[PDB]
Amino acid sequence: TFMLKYDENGTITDAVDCSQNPLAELKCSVKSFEIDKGIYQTSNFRVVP
Amino acid sequence: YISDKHLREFVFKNKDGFLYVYKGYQPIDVVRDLPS
Amino acid sequence: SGDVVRFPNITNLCPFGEVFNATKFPSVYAWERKKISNCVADYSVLFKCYGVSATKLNDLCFSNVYADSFVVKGDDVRQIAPCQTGVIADYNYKLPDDFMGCVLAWNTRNINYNYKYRYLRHGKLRPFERPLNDYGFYTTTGIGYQPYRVVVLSFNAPATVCGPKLSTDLIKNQCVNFNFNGLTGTGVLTPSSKRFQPFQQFGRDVSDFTDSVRDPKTSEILDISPCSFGGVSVITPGTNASSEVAVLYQDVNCT
Amino acid sequence: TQHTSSMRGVYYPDEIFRSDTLYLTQDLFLPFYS
Amino acid sequence: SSNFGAISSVLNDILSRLDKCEAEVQIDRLITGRLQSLQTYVTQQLIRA
Numbered sequence: 135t136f137m138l139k140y141d142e143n144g145t146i147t148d149a150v151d152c153s154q155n156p157l158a159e160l161k162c163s164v165k166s167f168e169i170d171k172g173i174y175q176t177s178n179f180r181v182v183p
Numbered sequence: 184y185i186s187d188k189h190l191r192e193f194v195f196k197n198k199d200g201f202l203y204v205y206k207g208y209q210p211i212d213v214v215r216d217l218p219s
Numbered sequence: 220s221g222d223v224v225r226f227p228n229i230t231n232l233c234p235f236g237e238v239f240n241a242t243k244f245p246s247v248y249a250w251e252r253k254k255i256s257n258c259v260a261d262y263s264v265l266f267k268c269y270g271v272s273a274t275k276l277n278d279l280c281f282s283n284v285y286a287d288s289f290v291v292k293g294d295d296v297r298q299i300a301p302c303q304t305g306v307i308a309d310y311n312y313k314l315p316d317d318f319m320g321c322v323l324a325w326n327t328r329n330i331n332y333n334y335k336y337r338y339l340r341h342g343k344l345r346p347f348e349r350p351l352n353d354y355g356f357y358t359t360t361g362i363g364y365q366p367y368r369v370v371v372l373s374f375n376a377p378a379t380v381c382g383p384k385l386s387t388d389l390i391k392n393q394c395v396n397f398n399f400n401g402l403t404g405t406g407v408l409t410p411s412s413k414r415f416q417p418f419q420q421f422g423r424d425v426s427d428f429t430d431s432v433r434d435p436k437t438s439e440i441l442d443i444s445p446c447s448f449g450g451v452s453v454i455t456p457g458t459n460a461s462s463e464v465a466v467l468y469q470d471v472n473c474t
Numbered sequence: 475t476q477h478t479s480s481m482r483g484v485y486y487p488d489e490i491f492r493s494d495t496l497y498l499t500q501d502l503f504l505p506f507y508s
Numbered sequence: 509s510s511n512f513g514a515i516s517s518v519l520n521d522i523l524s525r526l527d528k529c530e531a532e533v534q535i536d537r538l539i540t541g542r543l544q545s546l547q548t549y550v551t552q553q554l555i556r557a
């Protein structure tokens with residue numbers, strides 16, 4: 135999964151991956167490029183048998 | 184089917200019996216590796 | 220009030236005739252496809268349709284249509300459907316679980332020891348892709364599995380095959396129902412300036428809503444808005460003093 | 475020789491036009507720093 | 509903007525591709541899903557008020 139930032143008169147200007155870093159997953163979950171200080175819940179973890 | 188430095192990028196994908204070909208272009212600097 | 224419909228340039232009638240009236244039909248173990256494009260095709264010359272109603276097929280426009288040559292036993296025609304349980308159907312021709320087109324049944328009385336089908340293969344088959352036994356309909360007498368001709372049609376994208384219907388002129392700054400390449404809607408059309416890529420077609424803003432349309436004929440830019448609507452209210456002094464009320468129309472410049 | 479790919483391998487996933495918005499997809503793409 | 513299990517998420521695309529007995533079930537699914545969403549929004553608004 136990706137998340138693409140368009141613009142006015144806009145082609146693809148910036149994009150950050152959704153499965154690279156926990157910060158990247160946080161950016162992908164809050165759906166914004168700027169996250170203020172705090173605690174956030176993103177997904178659930180599980181062990182594959 | 185018959186039809187009519189720099190870095191050129193082709194992206195190939197295959198699904199549902201179909202194959203998509205994508206093209207791109209960018210002028211780059213002459214260097215041994217690829218710049219970011 | 221009024222109506223605007225814009226379609227691309229009409230072309231010649233494309234020849235469905237020789238692909239339905241063909242003197243020879245390929246087998247199933249060798250699967251040939253017949254690509255059909257750049258058309259104004261009339262379907263009134265023409266079963267079961269899965270996804271598109273056959274009566275309303277004449278109106279909407281498509282990107283590209285694909286027709287397939289396919290010869291199969293008589294009672295096996297009911298196994299050509301999305302997600303069928305047939306292992307033989309799993310081995311010769313698989314239809315995808317999501318389907319859009321139609322299946323047509325045809326007779327072949329004139330047609331032996333020439334057609335085969337593969338029934339031994341390791342693993343399943345992904346759809347629309349490419350040890351043998353002879354078929355059984357060699358005896359021309361009517362038994363019950365007399366062969367049939369089956370052609371299947373398979374149909375967001377650039378469009379070149381549209382229904383034959385008259386194109387009209389375009390009205391501006393007055394809300395109207397519009398039909399752009401089969402995309403229907405209703406609203407005000409405005410000549411606003413929003414940039415498009417030269418290959419780009421449509422425009423949506425937030426909620427999968429058709430907002431901007433490139434004109435299919437003169438290649439200009441049309442913004443779509445919904446024309447005026449809202450809640451209405453009535454104010455009254457109570458029906459004990461009078462019977463005259465007043466009407467409030469909400470959030471409209473009511474010229 | 476063994477290199478890395480960063481900020482590369484992005485394309486338009488579909489054929490509609492947006493402005494000042496954000497969209498998420500699930501198709502095949504090139505992961506960053508691969 | 510979700511289809512709720514129907515063949516498409518746009519009502520005008522449903523009414524331009526089906527007759528008046530195969531589009532009825534898809535229309536029913538859209539009615540049920542959007543009714544659930546609107547009722548949920550009304551309940552949250554009542555509690556916040």
Ligand SMILES: *[C@@H]1O[C@H](CO)[C@@H](O)[C@H](O)[C@H]1NC(C)=O
Nearest residue numbers: 226227228229435436437438
């Ligand atoms: C389509 O038809 C219009 C109306 O005759 C014409 O002006 C135009 O050149 C045609 N071709 C294209 C590509 O729009």
Ligand SMILES: *[C@@H]1O[C@H](CO)[C@@H](O)[C@H](O)[C@H]1NC(C)=O
Nearest residue numbers: 392447469470471472473474
């Ligand atoms: C309503 O529209 C007219 C003409 O476009 C304009 O003169 C008038 O100022 C508008 N009303 C408001 C409240 O903006």
